[PDB]
Amino acid sequence: NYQIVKTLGEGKVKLAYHTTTGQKVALKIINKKMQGRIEREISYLRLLRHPHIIKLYDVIKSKDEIIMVIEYAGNELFDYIVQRDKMSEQEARRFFQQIISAVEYCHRHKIVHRDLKPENLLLDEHLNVKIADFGLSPNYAAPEVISGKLYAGPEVDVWSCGVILYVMLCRRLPFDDESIPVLFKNISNGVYTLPKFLSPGAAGLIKRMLIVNPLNRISIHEIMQDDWFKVDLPEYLL
């Protein structure tokens, strides 16, 4: 927060830490040159305070630059998936509970994310998921998000969460194809395989999330009442 340590990449992004609390932080230095989307990020991040949504500690502004002071989470959930073996159901469920809790909180404050993806689901040093963006950082997009028509309600995040769960459990994307037209057709028709190695609870939950007609798609609140979902659910997540 207070004093800078290192430049993490490219305005630029720096690593820093609060000299009182010791908290690790990222400084996103944005130089004035669209603006409404940055403001949307800042506004959303100030409104939503949840253990699995990245914290915004401060926004420092001048005539030339905007500096967002954001809690540091140094890894992506997807590099964790890729770099390790096919993860245990217990491990996947742990992450999934955290994601769903955070999404529920978003929907509660009338925010539909629409952009739940690899780059957006960060992991901190205690392996806690942190939703980090809201839009300003294909296989994960609901059919109605892909096409123009059909309004994209809370249900598009349910679909995305169903893909995320599928990936964690199966170490593959349900709708992926090397061919562009085949991929888009698979998503729009909801064509995929539920592997036989999946527990009945995991498969039953995924099946109800990946439904084309959003009306028949399971809701966030129904998910949170699912038997498989509830196993070892930490009280703080309710």
Strands 24-31, 3-9: pairing is: unpaired
- Residue 58: CB atoms within 10 A of its CB come to 12
Annotated binding residue at 13? yes
Q: Which of 57, 101, 42, 52 is nearest to 77 (CA)?
A: 52
Catalytic residue of the set 85, 115, 177, 226: 115
Distance CA 54, CA 75 (A): 13
Residue that the structure tokens 């096409």 belong to: 147
Residue 115 annotated among the catalytic residues of the structure:
yes
Annotated binding residue at 162? no
Residue that the structure tokens 């940055």 belong to: 38
Annotated binding residue at 89? no
Annotated binding residue at 12? yes
Report which DSSP code applies to 237. Answer: G
E strand segments, 111-150 = 121-123, 129-131
Annotated binding residue at 55? no
Are 51 and 236 in contact by the 8 Å Cβ rule? The answer is yes
Q: At residue 228, what is the residue type?
A: W
Distance CA 57, CA 59 (A): 7
Annotated binding residue at 8? yes
Q: Which of 59, 144, 150, 44 is nearest to 102 (CA)?
A: 44
Distance CA 67, CA 188 (A): 40
Annotated binding residue at 190? no
> Annotated binding site for ATP, which residues?
8-13, 28
Q: Which residues are annotated as a binding site?
A: 8-13, 28
Catalytic residues: 115
